[PDB]
Enzyme design. Structure first.
Site, mmCIF file in Angstrom:
data_model
loop_
_atom_site.group_PDB
_atom_site.id
_atom_site.type_symbol
_atom_site.label_atom_id
_atom_site.label_comp_id
_atom_site.label_asym_id
_atom_site.label_seq_id
_atom_site.Cartn_x
_atom_site.Cartn_y
_atom_site.Cartn_z
ATOM 1 N N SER A 1 0.945 -0.977 -0.059
ATOM 2 C CA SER A 1 -0.007 0.013 0.177
ATOM 3 C C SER A 1 0.989 1.275 -0.112
ATOM 4 O O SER A 1 0.378 2.343 0.460
ATOM 5 C CB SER A 1 -0.869 0.060 1.147
ATOM 6 O OG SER A 1 -1.764 -1.022 1.141
ATOM 7 N N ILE A 2 2.111 1.197 -0.192
ATOM 8 C CA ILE A 2 3.057 2.384 -0.359
ATOM 9 C C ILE A 2 2.547 3.296 -1.458
ATOM 10 O O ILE A 2 2.592 3.149 -2.682
ATOM 11 C CB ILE A 2 4.616 1.911 -0.468
ATOM 12 C CG1 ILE A 2 5.019 1.675 0.815
ATOM 13 C CG2 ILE A 2 5.207 3.092 -1.094
ATOM 14 C CD1 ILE A 2 6.318 0.475 0.488
ATOM 15 N N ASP A 3 1.970 4.343 -0.951
ATOM 16 C CA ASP A 3 1.394 5.238 -2.249
ATOM 17 C C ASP A 3 2.485 6.136 -2.532
ATOM 18 O O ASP A 3 3.086 7.002 -1.722
ATOM 19 C CB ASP A 3 0.356 6.032 -1.541
ATOM 20 C CG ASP A 3 -0.014 7.622 -2.231
ATOM 21 O OD1 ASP A 3 0.385 7.446 -3.527
ATOM 22 O OD2 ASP A 3 -0.029 8.246 -1.524
ATOM 23 N N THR A 4 2.974 5.820 -3.755
ATOM 24 C CA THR A 4 4.341 6.323 -4.368
ATOM 25 C C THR A 4 4.156 7.934 -4.838
ATOM 26 O O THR A 4 4.897 8.641 -4.967
ATOM 27 C CB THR A 4 4.961 5.290 -5.200
ATOM 28 O OG1 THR A 4 5.362 4.422 -4.714
ATOM 29 C CG2 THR A 4 6.058 5.920 -6.409
#
EC number: 3.6.4.-
Lengths: 423, 214, 71
Positions: B167-170
């Site tokens: 879920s790392i929102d880049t």
């Protein structure tokens, strides 16, 4: 991405039980229609028994997430991510720890058991991969139990290692077999704290702080002995400094281009200082004879030319008197051609030091030789107990304390030796 | 380098989607600047406000802490949450340390030590959603290093499989980025906010624009 | 910490043994251990535990067969 059929096969493999509405699944409505599972056996996510709610699939970040309708805590969330290779991920994670590095020599260095080791005829990389499996996640741990998969990961690591690094860069650190001792203050790095120092050599013995203390009679009587050797006499006032400096420069890691000769008579403890220094250093200290200094080292085989590789200090003594007719005097060409920073990747920092009982004679002399001649002498003229102390080697750390103090006085300001062209 | 220069003023946007012309003229109704005490007092007096943290000038001072956010739409139990977050920290720290050693020329061990030393956690009042922002206190970096690190983090997020990592929102590594202030409402008619953790009771540790080198 | 007044607890999940502290789980660390792994790996572990194969400084492998070390 991959074909939809492979995705359906993967999700069907994930769920142990069969799917009754598999035919209803299509490529355009695979995230909306609920799936009904024939619950004849407990699902792999959570055991429980006979779930009464259909699950659902969601597509995010190129991954398929399975979530059960209703309460979320009943069934554990499962994710089918990253259509691609897993072993490449493991190789990436292993390389991310900087445990394996490549050197310009063509071989690889590996960090195992708190030590940097390189050896080209054994599979060190596979040993590292087996050892480091605990730091990886659980699902990656069981993947490394097969030697074939370990070979695949090793191949991936080899391919993705393009850049080359150089080891043994800091001359201000003396390595041990279980850590590194530093010259700035004299405290011993141990474990991963010494990892940043790319040291590939060792002294061959442990370092223990218990003997590296100042309040004890051992080094008090050690200065007693050295005052019996080098008393605080006016005749030694000029000698002492340089003498001390030379001993401290025995510990330095930079290249040495200055010679150092000690002149004296028989039964003058000159050979005793060899033992005091060698006990203090270990395997790095090396002896040499008169065979190589008077003979051309670039002609024919020379094992010593290969041997001085990363040696710390080299000692030459028992020189016969060169004033005799027919005795072949020293060749100054050799003494020029070892003073270079490299004698074929012959990284050389061993300090040349000589004990002789005769006045040297040179075939030809110019400014160059006298610019790099340094002389020191010893002043006194028997205690056999210290000989036993040296043989059983309880006098190391007390002596390295003196070397460290002298290094503080002289070499920390600058790495330089002052020769005496006077003789 | 910076030495004496240490950022301590908190720059805040009071509404999402501020006009550019208002921003250039420092509109008091859209752009403001407080201190730590001023900001907490302003938050305390008005609980219904919407405050959003961002920088003002990126061409002079661009020293910030290392920030990422995570958002799974799935509630998890406590112990699995602890395991997931520990794996998250070890993976992200190892990855950024490798990037710093390779491209930034830094040293791996001190980076991992500083980044594993202190970190702060947030939480969401939602019962079906698990979202949190982590900020590393003892790590400082510029904008260009972050946009370079963007590509690395995105392949890391694709590569891993841990639920918290995916879920790392880049996208938060972009120019003129903004982040929601903790304890503040997102929408004018939304009750979902963020809450603190017992380890950290100070708001200065929850703002990335505050720079204080120890 | 000091003595972990709250008792610990054990669990099994996906063939992995999990250890966690009761009460406040954030006051300790949760540990995970694989159960078995591969069978041939277990056989290798059992053989190695008998100290019958050794490695010398020179690079040799010595084995203990018929009441004698050989290489």
């Amino acid at each position: 991405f991959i074909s939809f059929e492979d995705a359906i096969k993967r999700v069907s493999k994930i769920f142990i039980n069969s799917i009754i509405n598999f035919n209803d699944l299509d490529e355009n409505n695979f995230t909306t229609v609920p799936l009904v599972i024939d619950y004849v056996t407990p699902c792999a996510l959570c055991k429980k028994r006979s779930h009464k709610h259909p699950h659902q699939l969601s597509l995010e970040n190129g991954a398929i997430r399975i979530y059960k309708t209703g309460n979320p805590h009943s069934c554990k969330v499962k994710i089918v991510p990253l259509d691609g290779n897993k072993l490449f991920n493991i190789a990436q994670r292993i390389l991310d720890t900087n445990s394996v590095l490549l050197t310009e020599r063509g071989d690889h260095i590996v960090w195992i058991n708190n030590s940097w080791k390189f050896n080209s005829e054994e599979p060190l990389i596979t040993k590292l991969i087996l050892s480091i499996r605990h730091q990886l996640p659980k699902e990656y741990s069981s993947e490394l139990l097969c030697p074939r998969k370990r070979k695949t990961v090793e191949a991936n690591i080899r391919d993705m290692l393009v850049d080359s690094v150089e080891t043994d860069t800091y001359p201000d650190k003396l390595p041990f077999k279980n850590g590194v001792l530093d010259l700035v203050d004299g405290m011993f790095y141990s474990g991963d704290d010494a990892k940043k120092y790319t040291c590939t050599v060792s002294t061959g013995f442990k370092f223990d702080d218990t003997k590296f203390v100042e309040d004890s009679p051992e080094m008090e009587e050690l200065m007693n002995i050295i005052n019996d050797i080098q008393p605080l006499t006016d005749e030694n006032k000029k000698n002492r400094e340089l003498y001390e400096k030379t001993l401290s420069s025995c510990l330095c890691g930079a290249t040495k281009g200055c010679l150092t000769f000690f002149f004296g008579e028989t039964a003058t403890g000159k050979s005793t200082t060899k033992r005091l220094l060698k006990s203090a250093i270990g395997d790095l200290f090396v002896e040499t004879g008169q065979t190589i200094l008077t003979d051309v080292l670039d002609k024919g085989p020379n094992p010593f030319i290969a041997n001085m590789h990363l040696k710390r200090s080299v000692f030459c003594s028992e020189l016969p008197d060169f004033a005799c007719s027919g005795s072949k005097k020293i060749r100054s060409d050799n003494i020029k051609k070892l003073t270079e920073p490299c004698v074929i990747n012959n990284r050389n920092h061993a300090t040349i030091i000589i004990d002789t009982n005769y006045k040297p004679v040179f075939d030809r002399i110019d400014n160059a030789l006298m610019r790099r001649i340094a002389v020191v002498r010893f002043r006194t003229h028997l205690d056999e107990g210290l000989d036993g102390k040296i043989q059983n080697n309880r006098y190391r750390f007390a002596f390295l304390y003196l070397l460290v103090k002298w290094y503080k006085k002289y070499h920390i300001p600058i790495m330089k030796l002052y020769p005496t062209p006077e003789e | 380098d910076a030495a004496i220069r240490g950022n301590d003023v908190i720059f805040v946007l009071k509404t999402i989607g501020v006009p550019s012309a208002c921003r250039q003229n420092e509109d008091p109704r859209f752009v403001e600047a407080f201190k730590c005490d001023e900001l907490e007092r302003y938050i305390d007096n008005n609980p219904e406000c919407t405050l959003f943290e961002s920088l003002r000038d990126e061409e002079a001072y661009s020293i910030v802490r290392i920030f990422m956010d995570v958002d799974l739409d799935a509630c998890l139990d406590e112990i699995d949450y602890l395991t997931a977050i520990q794996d998250f920290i070890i993976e992200v720290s190892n990855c950024v340390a490798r990037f710093a050693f390779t491209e930034c020329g830094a040293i791996h061990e001190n980076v991992i030590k500083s980044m594993r030393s202190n970190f702060s956690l947030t939480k969401s009042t939602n019962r079906d959603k698990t979202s949190f922002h982590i900020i590393f206190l003892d790590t400082y970096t510029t904008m260009d290093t972050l946009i370079a690190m963007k590509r690395t983090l995105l392949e890391l997020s694709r590569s891993s499989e841990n639920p918290l990592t995916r879920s790392i929102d880049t996208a938060v590594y972009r120019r003129k980025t903004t982040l929601r202030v903790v304890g503040t409402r997102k929408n004018p008619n939304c009750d979902t906010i963020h809450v603190m953790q017992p380890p950290h009771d100070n708001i200065e540790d929850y703002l990335f624009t505050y720079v204080d080198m120890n």
